[PDB]
Amino acid sequence: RKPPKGMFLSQEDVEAVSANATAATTVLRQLDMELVSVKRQIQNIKQTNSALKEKLDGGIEPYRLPEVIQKCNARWTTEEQLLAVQAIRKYGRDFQAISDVIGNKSVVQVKNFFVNYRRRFNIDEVLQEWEAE
Amino acid sequence: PRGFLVKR
Amino acid sequence: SGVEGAAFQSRLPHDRMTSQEAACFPDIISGPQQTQKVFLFIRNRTLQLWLDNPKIQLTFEATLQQLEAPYNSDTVLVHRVHSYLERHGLINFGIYKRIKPLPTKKTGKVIIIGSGVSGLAAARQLQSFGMDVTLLEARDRVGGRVATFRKGNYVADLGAMVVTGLGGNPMAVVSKQVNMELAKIKQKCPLYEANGQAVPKEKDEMVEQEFNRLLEATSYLSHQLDFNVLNNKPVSLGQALEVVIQLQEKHVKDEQIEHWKKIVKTQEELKELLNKMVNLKEKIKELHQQYKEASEVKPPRDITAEFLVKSKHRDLTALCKEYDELAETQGKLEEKLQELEANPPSDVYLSSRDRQILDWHFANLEFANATPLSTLSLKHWDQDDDFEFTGSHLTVRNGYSCVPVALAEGLDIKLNTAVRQVRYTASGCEVIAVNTRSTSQTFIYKCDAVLCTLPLGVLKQQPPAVQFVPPLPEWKTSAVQRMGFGNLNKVVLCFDRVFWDPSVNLFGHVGSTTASRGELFLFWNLYKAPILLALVAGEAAGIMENISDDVIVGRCLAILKGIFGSSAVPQPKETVVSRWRADPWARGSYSYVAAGSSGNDYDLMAQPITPGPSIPGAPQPIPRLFFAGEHTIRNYPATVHGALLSGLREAGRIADQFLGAMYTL
Ligand SMILES: Cc1cc2nc3c(=O)[nH]c(=O)nc-3n(C[C@H](O)[C@H](O)[C@H](O)COP(=O)(O)OP(=O)(O)OC[C@H]3O[C@@H](n4cnc5c(N)ncnc54)[C@H](O)[C@@H]3O)c2cc1C
Question: Fewer Cβ atoms within 10 A, N terminus or C terminus of chain A?
């Protein structure tokens, strides 16, 4: 029914090695050269990845901005309103980005702002100006 | 034949 | 044990009628199941009786005496059974005390060529049936391929040596009849490489296991995959093993390839992640500078200038978020590569050291079949497996020849008589022989029938050593050519002292190359005296015959020195070297199933020859030329017991032919 354990013999493999006189060593050569090919291909990409790792050395430590934990506020200062309109011009509908720029407004408050000031800040125009880019 | 094999 | 145990010990199913029984008792087997069971019991019980005491003749009277009801009620059936068993040598075979001294006058005349075991077996039987029997032997001794060297206290068999188990072995009966000192063989066989260093139990076990597994694989190739024809030529076992080994090497390389192929797929996935990470660190370095410059603009500042600072702050932490998630992925892949590289698949399938130890195992197989594996039939080399005996193998400690010699007692044996021509016709046979000493001194033997027990190597000779008149029919000679006749030699080393492990029966030696794997690869310690026995098998067997004894014994000592110590191995007092292929009365050792042959050829060999009629238009003649011998018994070839059984077989057939079968009514 099936070969013994640790023994691999498919009908296909038999016909391939018994095809002719030295079809045995021919197949064993292809795989011997395939092994060399893939082995030096490893060292090649291992060399490339080693050089790319030295450029990433140090990480992004000199470029990290300290933790600015600030309490959320309900009131919209004139300042905050102006930041918002500019944030809409730059970020469109990304309510998360806008929220982070202003700093003290939650993602829902940003969505509220869109509805509340829609007329007074021509937010339609500001959004279509962002779309043109 | 087989029967003569050592180390069975 | 019981009646069923006797059927087993006689190689018969206890609960079923055989083909040979169906022929002699067609009334019973075609009849009701009730009768068959009575027959089977009668048969079995009679066998039991004979087996329980094989040193005395079992008569019909003694048999009926010890039967119960309703078995002893039908005395003709009991007689038919006893006679059948007696005729075919299942009871009253070998050397036993005869109750009724032999019949006054003989009937029919049979010439038996060869006094090997097969010949001797038949001879006794035919004489027991009251026929005139004469054996013609070319040698100056009986036994033929059962050769036993004797000198002083040294006793070593140059031919047959091992009894392959007693469970069903007719030699078990023989051993009870003859003073045979049967010692068991301990299965442990330590190997020793070319240098003399023992093979570590780690290697030993893995190679042996690999050997057995490679064998099973060839068996799988043959029966399941049907790999039996290659370029119109029949596939040998040697071919098949190579093919299997190559596929095991191919797989090893296949495994390595897809393992490294796994590494490059991950290494190249990492390469793309590093490019993304480098391009992001570049944009972070730039964006930080931008935010820096936005903060340098000291307050107070308008809202656009304030927004810029805030904007670049968000943009920078967003890109700092991504790089942190990508350093996470880098950590995952970086260890996943250390995972796959930590556990590599097999470096090689087998090393040069391995392949050498595997070659010893092939030598074992080449010894067992007495031939290069390139000659054996893949499909059939092991066709007699089903009929192996049960129990541990034994050796004859007092020498095997004791058996032929004991069988030869009370028999007309003409030694030094070399048969040259066999002539057989409708009216009878004449055998022309000569004296081996003065080869011009000619003899003529007239007989009703000839039993030929010539070795297959002899029958094979070209040009013929024995001429058949008329020539043997095409079907017979084709069988002779097709069949394989192997070669296996022994070197007997006799010392003054035991320098080996006295509790070890046999130890191997690993040769340097594949070419020399058979050469002195095995050593036997079996006998009372300090005797070591070295095998020469495989391709090496044939080539070592063209080499002098001194050189052979030289290489023997060389090896033993390497294993036991240069000063632990003394000079041998007596040495013998067999040359079975060169021996004109053997022309080889024993038969094997050659590639292109099958088990059916063995049957063809046992088939008797019936001559043509003298006068044209005369009735179909009696069969005149009969064949026994090791090469004629499909289920037990290449053995003593096989030859023995074939002898019994033919005696039965001859007696049936010339004395008539009274038991078939
Ligand atoms: C090295 C070796 C080891 C063996 N070990 C074992 C073993 O361990 N166990 C086992 O069961 N079997 C073993 N055998 C096999 C066994 O020995 C034989 O199968 C058996 O002895 C054959 O008996 P035979 O009567 O068929 O042939 P033989 O015993 O050869 O009888 C044939 C006879 O014919 C004679 N003869 C030949 N030509 C002529 C002629 N022209 N005129 C007259 N006579 C002639 C021969 O001299 C010989 O006596 C071994 C064989 C060998 C070679």
Answer: N
